Design a protein around this nucleic acid. Structure first.
Ligand SMILES: [Zn+2]
Lengths: 144, 342, 97, 287, 175, 839
RNA sequence: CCCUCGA
DNA sequence: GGAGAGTATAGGTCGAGGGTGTACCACGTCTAAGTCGCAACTGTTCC
DNA sequence: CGGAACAGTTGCGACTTAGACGTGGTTGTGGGAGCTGCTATACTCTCC
């Protein structure tokens, strides 16, 4: 890695992008167990999705060694690798309901408002469930 | 309106409805409409139209869709960047991000648990509203409504707070950093010094130059290996001092006093091993650093590569900048006692 | 070494010192170790690598649902990662196998 | 280098690669703690803000209707041609009518029915720099800005060479406002760089624009680098706007080079100096 | 039964704006009050068949709310405290590393450890190549005798002899 | 704090000032709480007669054992059954009550702490006239601030409308609320009709009638709920006019009384707002914006209509330590009340005794949360006795109920004419806290209502009497006060016919001596304790005088003290009151004296012994060391100083040495504030001081096992372990330099963390010992000294430790610091510098 | 982060 | 259309030493700690 | 410096357990703290 960097680009990250980055979904509020001081599985610190906390050691302890580098424990699902990956590996949360990214709603001027030609007070009433909005009407059927 | 006619239309609240309006949105139509309004229109409505066309036209280009403004999945930052450390007293400290993520996860899971139980619509809508509010707080907290507060009514620091502010990533961690091979101490007046020299305490110079000393006394019989050199320097064995004098020769250092108002707030000097724990500053540069000697302290940085040393000797050397870069007037100039004496 | 300290370095126009302060003296994780390795062996200082705080910046941006990529002149993005074998190869070479 | 001239520090001609904008900003900011009018005036000038104690300026030569009654001042100007009469709305009685030399006349205060030239100040006080731009042209605004800025430092016993303030002022007008888009795709009202504006004008000029004066904040946030602007101010705003626009930072800036750990494109980091090839001469290798 | 759903939506929902004001009193935070009221409604709707038709609903829901707050409260009180911090102090990081299995290593430590250990290398060189490979595998990589024999294409007995003999050899060589 | 406890000292002083039937801080909380009744009125619980038991442990015991200085609190709780008539009277233990020491401090978890008095705005009504509207026209605002309750704001609009804001709620015409209080649209025109702006507001009022008004009010408070008439009126009743959710203190009541002139007959009965207070507030505001200079209200008399000064000390109040603690007691006590109510419905009467109803946990927890989390409860600053003394005298504007640092403008930080004799204008930080922290003046008191008073001398018929009167800031504005520098002869007559005085709102004027009311009781009356110690203060500019006051509290205690030749006379009375000096409580003869203690035999035949603090570490690492100044057989008196403290010499504050000084440039080494010292001050230890560091280490449970404190440290030479004892802990009296081991400790290390070379040796050599890392506690860089102390706490014993911590070791190292280049010296005039050279 | 302090 | 108001932004640098847990019972559900056997697995000991 | 033969150790793998620990139900009342003592400027919204 030298200066080959040419450009640096932003775009909106699609849900597909977010799920491609992710190494797993975080399903649990728990952080670490107090007695073991080990990260709870499928939690914010989970080793299975984010990577091992100790070099070359999986969560269950079946594999502790470099000899196993690159393999995934059948029991715990952790990968034998360096703990360094815990700074480069991202998770994700699958939302039960869609959610607006607040940068594009509450920022001034409201980007959603300019896109849909909606008043930001009205947009607020919709997003926060103080008002209904009409997604579609059937013109032919209503006329008939 | 749904009880009758409900089969002739569709309606919803929340972000799923906004997602629908975006899915059904004709971009080119609204763009050409806006361009027509800009052309044939005038007044404030022309301004509204233009400002809207900036956004819509922005989304007109390919590879970029408005759908991204509504998320069905929220990314999670790696744990090392939001760590959790044990404290003296058996307690723990977490980044605020962990608590914000925790609220999002709890409200999402409760929304699933309510969907499965066939909960009344008003309750499910309450849970959806709370999920939207918690992802709001996670992204930009306090941007809408009152902020989510931890203990002490301290509002938690969102993902937007990492980037912005004087303590943000850009200002604190990117345009500036803490560095190796640096030290600091209180400054005293150096009246015996030549302009290109500065007094360096022995212990400061031994720490800053530690690897150079180590290699040097490894080459000489003093140390058997480099690790014996390390332990030998950490104990301050008498053999090191002579070696130090040799490794410091014509190796410049950078001195800095905060605040740095202009580039002469950092100057390069040749270090001189000096007795005591204080940095000795040449009397003539006190104008450039604004050093009051009432307890001012300064910082020392050690150039490493050939290019850095060369830059210190040539560009930043104390006696190569005598003149004020602003007015061109002389800066390192007699003042106070010196003036009186003359 | 803060913002205003960097302005001074830029005002002097000393690029290598400013780059050295912000990479191998602070952030660059392979460079900081290779630099110490070079001083002890009495060799030239190695060329700096990528500061960690930039990779951290990209990750905090992704967490905001911003899709950021560092593009080559080809127009294709660049994965930021290190080959894990180099350290193991040196460790195995140190034992003579 | 030649347009900049001497480097005040070295006393010689400025080297190629010296970063004179940072030197200018440091030179202007360092004395700032000594300014007791004052430093807020230096801010008011550098941000191109409509001044308090605003002094109106004449649009065109003509005759003056001076109402000036009941604790109020109102100035109408009937141009010498058949043009419409320009009317200044509100001028408080605390302001003073300017004493000046009337063309084809003597030196006296502004009075009703008087004849005034184009660029005449109607009152005494601070002039709106935007007005002197759209009337007297950019080379006049340069003079007004450098003089009014340097005046504050002079009053405090501080001498800054004019060239630093000139660097900043140069950055203050790089751009033109788009009036009529024409065939050039430029959105009207946007602020486009002068060079880019003249380049995008191709008959094989449809784009119409007028020079703009924009403060240092607005000119900073307007840079082509979203990375440079995100690290300055309004980071949320800059990042949303930059994401929506799929902007691609070119990385050529020096602040961007600082961020990514690349040698700044200034001083010893310039391609000219950094790629130097060093070889010993044959005669020296002989010995 | 849908009767329970309709009767629930008519009788229970108007009490929300009341119950929420109660949840505040316990949490004294709006977010935890919202979460508390919501979990309460989970319990209530899930268990609404057990409620008696004519009896007063307000006290019932109130008790569910309190009891939920207590389950959460004792639950949180058994766990060690998690303090949210805007930034983790450098003192906290070092203090935590004093008890760590691996501390905070300077670039110097990393660079020195990465240097070859000469004595060990030259001692290993004196071993016969077979003993060197075997003792390497076992005492460094940690292979079992079965896998070491599989890699070296010898019976396990050979692995045992070479491990013992190379080990004693290194013991005499290095001391 | 004596008022909080209801101490007999406070009782006598209360009887001296006159008795209102005085109630202590605790007594008042108990009486407002009682009775605790069932919602059916079937039963009641009442508290009375609180008592404090003996202290659990002495002060230095808590400091050593990490305890809290405290005493058990007992109250008599009487339960009554309103049916059977049966009474049950019990004694309840309310908790271990944190106690104020003799020095006016608290020890919480072993650490000594100070509760800084808080500057807040007293409850009352405050009018603000802002001309800053863009129209250039003046607007008039008012705030009604209670002690506890809801905020109420009235604002005349820039658009000319009278608005109302309730707890930040959005504005409505002032008539809307008045109508909703039961007022007709006509009755408002009767009282308020004189206002052309109130006439314009009633038409802009959108709806009329009490039902629509009360309904529109309930909508503003609750965003999404249904309104109801009886719910909303009982809501508005309980929001303001009810004692539970809205409390104006007696301070607020009297301030509103005096500000609106409503009750002249001085009824003390109830403190809450009244409908006549709302009418009086709008009427006051109405005439205000009109420009009237006076107003008279029905049943009210001659009150000037004027704006209020927010920073004036008659409008600005001091919440002292007793009042802060009382407020916390009220919170936790109300929580206990909630528990008692919930317990009244569940329990079986005749199966209930009070102690079954009373749960004390939230009270103790409420007290603990205050001392732990509060900005006012502060780590005591003890560099020397002066830093600690003024710390207890600090008046802080920052905190809960105060103002945020973000919201504090430059107008709050300015010296104010009401500060004279009350808050020192000199002493205050020069950093970002400038003007936000101040010192109580030497002669100032805090009156029972929280307002600061200063004494003055009655001036009668141009004569200066010896009668003393303590005046508040309000009382001081009605009179004419002559400065102390005003000359007087042997007779009370003034020397000059014109004298410079402060008369009205802090204007300074040459004035007739004929009319003079009061005079300052002395100079230094306007100055703090630290400022009163600056000799020739009047010759120093206020900035350097500020630097001098702050710098005295940064002085380190020297190995030997020396009083100044040139004092102000404040040094003795400062050292005694600070309390770091030992004083005889009773006159007697010294029976025995040693460095450890002094015993005094009173003429009673009773004796009293004083133990000496010997080489004790202060919070900042300075050396608190007491030495006896008396000899065996000496006769001492009550109040006499028995023993010197760290910065005292013979009982006078000695913060430094008397040095022979020459004023002259010397060869550039004293260039620009740099100081040149004689090496005599190094050789004779005149600037030497002792500094004591506390190094703490604990063995805890980790991922891979438990940590062990041991003398067995892998790959560590026996030479370097030589000063460790058998536990692995350094031996008392050893000389330790940076890098030396204070306490050996090992931590379990995983297999993967071994180097390949380290793995090979452990295998072939048959080492089966646990793999560990050396976590031993070592001396930090640039530190040296002697080990003067060790404390060990083990889980093996009953020593109470945090969860997961097996053993906790503290090591105390003491260093003698000779003066050296780079140290900072200062005089009392603000003159400072580093030592640039010692010659 | 906050408290408090140095230039 | 066009004006006020309501909301958004900004507000010096570097250092030193300190810093926290009211609230249902009466139980079944699970887990957090184990002692304890065969393989599986390390090691000597030869010929 | 091999290939079996033979005899000591971890170490995985079950299962009993006793207690922390979370679950049933849950029916007289009962709606938070805290604050708001910052200035100045640009610009979209939104009431008109
Ligand atoms: Zn595993």
């Amino acid at each position: 890695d030298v200066n080959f960097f040419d450009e640096l680009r932003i775009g909106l990250a699609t849900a597909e992008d977010i799920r491609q980055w992710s190494y797993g979904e975080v399903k649990k509020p728990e952080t670490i167990n107090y007695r073991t001081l080990k990260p709870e599985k499928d939690g914010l610190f989970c080793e299975k999705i984010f990577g091992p906390t100790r070099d070359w050691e999986c969560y269950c302890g079946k594999y502790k060694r470099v000899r196993f580098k690159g393999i995934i424990c059948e029991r715990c699902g952790v990968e034998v690798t360096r703990a360094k990956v815990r700074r480069e590996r991202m998770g994700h949360i699958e939302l039960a309901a869609p959610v607006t990214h607040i940068w594009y709603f509450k920022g001034v001027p409201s980007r959603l408002g300019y896109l849909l030609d909606l008043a930001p007070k009205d947009l607020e009433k919709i997003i926060y469930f103080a008002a209904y909005v009409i997604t579609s009407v059937d013109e032919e059927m209503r006329h008939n | 309106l749904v009880d009758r006619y409900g089969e002739y239309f569709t309606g919803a609240m929340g972000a799923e409805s906004i997602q629908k309006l975006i899915e059904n949105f004709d971009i080119d139509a609204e763009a050409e409409s806006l361009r027509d309004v800009i052309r044939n229109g005038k007044g404030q409505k022309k301004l509204r139209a233009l400002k809207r066309l900036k956004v819509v036209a922005a989304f007109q280009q390919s590879g970029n869709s408005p759908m991204g403004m509504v998320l069905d999945a929220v990314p999670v930052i790696p744990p090392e960047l939001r760590p959790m450390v044990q404290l003296d007293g058996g307690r723990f400290a977490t980044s605020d991000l962990n608590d914000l993520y925790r609220r999002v996860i709890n409200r999402n899971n409760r929304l699933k648990r309510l969907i499965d139980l066939g909960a009344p619509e008003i309750i499910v809508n309450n849970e959806k509203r709370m999920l939207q509010e918690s992802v709001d707080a996670l992204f930009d907290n306090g941007r809408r409504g009152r902020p989510v507060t931890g203990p002490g009514n301290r509002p938690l620091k969102s993902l937007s707070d990492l980037l912005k502010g004087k303590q943000g990533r850009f200002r604190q961690n990117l345009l500036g950093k803490r560095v190796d091979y640096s030290g600091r101490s209180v400054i005293v007046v150096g009246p015996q010094l030549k302009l290109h020299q500065c007094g360096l305490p022995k212990l400061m110079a031994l720490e800053l130059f530690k690897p150079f000393v180590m290699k040097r006394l490894v080459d000489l019989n003093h140390a058997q290996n480099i690790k014996s050199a390390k332990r030998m320097v950490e104990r301050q064995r008498p053999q090191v001092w002579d070696v130090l004098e040799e490794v410091i020769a014509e190796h410049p250092v950078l001195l800095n006093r905060a605040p740095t108002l202009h580039r002469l707030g950092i100057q390069a000097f040749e270090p001189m091993l000096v007795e005591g724990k204080a940095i000795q500053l040449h009397p003539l540069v006190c104008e450039a650093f604004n050093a009051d000697f009432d307890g001012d302290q300064m910082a020392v940085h050690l150039p490493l590569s050939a290019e850095a040393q060369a830059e210190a000797r040539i560009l930043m050397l104390s006696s190569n900048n005598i003149l004020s870069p602003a007015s061109g007037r002389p800066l390192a100039m007699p003042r106070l006692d010196m003036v009186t004496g003359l | 070494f803060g913002e205003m300290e960097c302005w001074a370095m830029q005002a002097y126009g000393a690029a290598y010192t400013l780059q050295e302060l912000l990479t191998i003296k602070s952030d660059d994780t392979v460079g900081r170790v290779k630099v110490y390795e070079a001083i002890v062996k009495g060799e030239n200082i190695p060329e700096p690598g990528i500061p960690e705080s930039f990779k951290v910046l990209l990750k905090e941006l992704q967490s905001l649902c911003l899709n950021v990529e560092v593009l080559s002149s080809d127009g294709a993005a660049i994965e930021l990662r290190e080959g894990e074998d180099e350290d193991l190869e040196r460790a195995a070479a140190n034992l003579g196998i | 280098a030649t347009c900049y001239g001497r480097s005040m520090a070295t006393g010689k001609l400025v080297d190629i690669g010296e970063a004179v904008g940072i030197v200018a900003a440091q030179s202007i900011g360092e004395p700032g703690t000594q300014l007791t009018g004052g430093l807020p005036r230096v801010q008011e000038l550098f941000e191109a803000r409509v001044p308090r104690g605003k002094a109106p300026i004449a649009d065109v030569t003509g005759r003056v209707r001076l109402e000036d009654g009941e604790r109020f001042y109102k100035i109408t100007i009937v141009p010498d041609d058949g043009g419409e009469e320009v009317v200044y709305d509100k001028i408080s009685k605390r302001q003073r009518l300017r004493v000046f030399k009337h063309e084809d006349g003597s030196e006296r205060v502004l009075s009703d029915g008087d004849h005034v030239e184009v660029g005449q100040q109607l009152m005494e006080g601070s002039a709106d720099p935007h007005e002197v731009l759209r009337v007297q042209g950019p080379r006049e605004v340069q003079i007004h800005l450098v003089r009014e800025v340097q005046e504050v430092y002079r009053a405090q016993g501080v001498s800054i060479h004019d060239k630093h303030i000139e660097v900043i002022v140069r950055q203050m007008l790089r751009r033109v406002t788009i009036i009529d888009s024409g065939s050039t795709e430029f959105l009207p009202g946007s602020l486009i760089d002068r060079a880019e504006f003249e380049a995008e004008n191709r008959r094989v000029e449809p784009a119409a624009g007028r020079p703009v004066l924009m403060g240092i904040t607005k000119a900073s946030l307007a840079t082509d680098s979203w990375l440079s602007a995100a690290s300055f101010q309004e980071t949320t705003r800059v990042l949303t706007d930059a994401a929506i626009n799929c902007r691609s930072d070119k990385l050529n800036g020096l602040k961007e080079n600082v961020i990514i750990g690349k040698l700044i494109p200034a001083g010893t980091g310039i391609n000219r100096y950094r790629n130097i090839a060093v070889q010993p001469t044959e005669e020296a290798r002989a010995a | 039964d849908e009767e329970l759903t309709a009767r629930f939506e008519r009788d229970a929902i108007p009490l929300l704006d009341q119950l929420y004001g109660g949840a505040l009193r316990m949490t004294r935070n709006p977010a935890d009050a919202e979460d508390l009221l919501q979990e309460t409604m989970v319990k209530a709707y899930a268990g609404f068949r057990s409620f008696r038709h004519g009896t007063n609903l307000k006290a019932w829901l109130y008790r569910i709310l309190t009891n939920t707050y207590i389950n959460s409260y004792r639950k949180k009180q058994r766990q060690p405290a998690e303090y949210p911090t805007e930034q983790i102090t450098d003192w906290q990081l070092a203090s935590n590393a004093e008890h760590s299995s691996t501390g905070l290593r300077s670039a110097e430590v990393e660079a020195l450890e990465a240097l070859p250990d000469t004595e060990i290398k030259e001692a290993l060189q004196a071993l016969p190549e077979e003993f060197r490979m075997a003792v390497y595998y076992a005492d460094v990589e940690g292979f079992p005798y079965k896998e070491i024999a599989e890699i070296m294409d010898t019976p396990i007995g050979t692995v045992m002899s070479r491990l013992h003999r190379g080990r004693r050899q290194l013991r005499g060589l290095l001391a | 704090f004596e008022w909080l406890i209801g101490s007999p000292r406070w009782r006598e002083s209360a009887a001296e000032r006159g008795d209102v039937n005085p109630v202590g801080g605790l007594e008042e909380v108990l009486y407002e709480l009682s009775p605790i009744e069932d919602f059916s009125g079937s039963m009641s619980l009442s508290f009375s007669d609180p008592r404090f038991d003996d202290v659990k442990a002495p002060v230095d015991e808590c400091k050593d054992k990490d305890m809290t200085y405290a005493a058990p609190l007992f109250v008599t709780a009487e339960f009554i059954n309103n049916n059977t008539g049966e009474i049950k009277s019990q004694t309840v233990f309310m908790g271990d009550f944190p106690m104020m020491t003799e020095k006016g401090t608290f020890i919480i978890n072993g650490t000594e702490r100070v509760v800084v008095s808080q500057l807040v705005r007293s409850p009352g009504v405050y009018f603000d006239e802002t001309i800053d509207k863009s129209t250039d026209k003046t607007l008039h605002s008012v705030k009604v601030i209670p002690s506890r309750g809801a905020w109420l704001e009235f604002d005349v609009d820039k658009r000319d409308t009278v608005g109302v804001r309730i707890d930040r709620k959005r504005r409505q015409p002032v008539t809307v609320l008045l109508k909703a209080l039961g007022w007709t649209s006509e009755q408002i025109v009767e009282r308020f009709g004189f206002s052309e702006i109130m006439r314009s507001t009633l038409e802009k009022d959108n709806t009329v009638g009490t039902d629509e008004a009360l309904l529109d009010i309930y909508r503003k408070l609750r965003p999404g709920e249904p309104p109801t008439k009886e719910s909303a009126q009982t809501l508005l009743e309980n929001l303001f006019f009810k004692e539970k959710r809205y409390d104006l203190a007696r301070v607020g009541r009297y301030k509103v009384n005096k500000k609106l002139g409503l009750h002249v007959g001085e009824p003390i009965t109830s403190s809450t707002l009244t409908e006549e207070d709302v009418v009086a507030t709008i009427e006051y505001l109405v005439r205000l914006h009109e420009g009237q200079t006076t107003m008279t209200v029905p049943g009210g008399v001659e009150v000037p209509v004027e704006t209020d000064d927010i920073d004036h000390f008659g409008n600005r109040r001091l919440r002292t330590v007793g009042e802060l603690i009382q407020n916390q007691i009220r919170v936790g006590m109300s929580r206990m009340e909630r528990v008692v109510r919930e317990r009244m419905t569940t329990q079986d009467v005749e199966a209930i005794t009070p102690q079954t109803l009373i749960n004390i946990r939230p009270v103790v927890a409420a007290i603990k949360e205050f001392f732990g989390t509060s900005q006012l409860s502060q780590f005591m600053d003890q560099n020397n006795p002066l830093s600690g003394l003024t710390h207890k005298r600090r008046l802080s504007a920052l905190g809960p109920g105060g103002l945020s640092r973000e919201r504090a403008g430059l107008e709050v930080r300015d010296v104010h004419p009401s500060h004279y004799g009350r808050m020192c204008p000199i002493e205050t930080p020069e950093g970002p806290n400038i003007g936000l922290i101040g010192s109580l003046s030497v002669y100032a008191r805090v009156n029972p209502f929280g307002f600061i008073e200063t004494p003055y001398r009655k001036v009668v018929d141009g004569v200066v009497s010896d009668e003393i009167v303590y005046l508040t800031a309000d009382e001081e504005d009605r009179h004419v006060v002559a400065q102390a520098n005003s000359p007087i002869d042997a007779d009370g007559r003034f020397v000059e016919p014109r004298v410079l005085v402060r008369r009205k709102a802090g204007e300074v004027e040459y004035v007739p001596s004929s009319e003079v009311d009061y005079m300052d009781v002395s100079p230094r009356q306007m100055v703090s304790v630290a400022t009163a110690m600056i000799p020739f203060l009047e010759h120093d500019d206020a900035n350097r005088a500020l630097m001098g006051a702050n710098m005295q509290r940064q002085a380190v205690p020297l190995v030997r003290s020396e009083a100044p030749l040139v004092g102000t006379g404040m040094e003795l009375r400062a050292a005694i009151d600070a309390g770091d000096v030992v004083v005889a409580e009773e006159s007697g003869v010294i029976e025995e004296v040693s460095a450890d203690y002094i015993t005094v035999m009173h003429d009673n035949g009773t004796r009293r012994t004083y133990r000496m603090r010997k080489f004790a570490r202060s919070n900042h690492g300075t050396c608190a060391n007491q030495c006896p100044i008396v000899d065996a057989g000496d006769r001492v008196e009550a109040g006499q100083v028995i023993a010197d403290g760290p910065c005292t010499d013979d009982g006078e504050m000695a913060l430094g040495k008397n040095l022979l000084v020459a004023i002259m440039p010397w060869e550039g080494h004293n260039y620009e504030d740099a100081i040149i010292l004689s090496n005599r001050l190094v050789e004779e230890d005149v600037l030497t001081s002792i500094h004591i560091e506390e190094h703490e280490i604990d063995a805890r449970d980790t991922k891979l096992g438990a940590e062990e404190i041991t003398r067995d440290i892998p790959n560590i030479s026996d030479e370097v372990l030589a000063d460790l004892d058998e536990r692995g802990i350094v031996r008392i009296g050893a000389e330790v330099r940076d890098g030396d081991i204070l306490v050996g400790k090992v931590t379990p290390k995983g297999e993967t963390e071994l180097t390949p070379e380290e793995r090979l040796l452990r295998a072939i050599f048959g080492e089966k010992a646990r793999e560990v890392r050396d976590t031993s506690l070592k001396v930090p860089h640039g530190e040296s000294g002697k080990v003067i102390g060790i404390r060990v706490f083990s889980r093996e014993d009953e020593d109470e430790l945090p969860a997961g911590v097996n053993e906790l070791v503290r090591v105390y190292v003491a260093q003698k610091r000779k003066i050296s280049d780079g140290d900072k010296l200062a005089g009392r005039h603000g003159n400072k510098g580093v030592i640039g050279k010692i010659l």
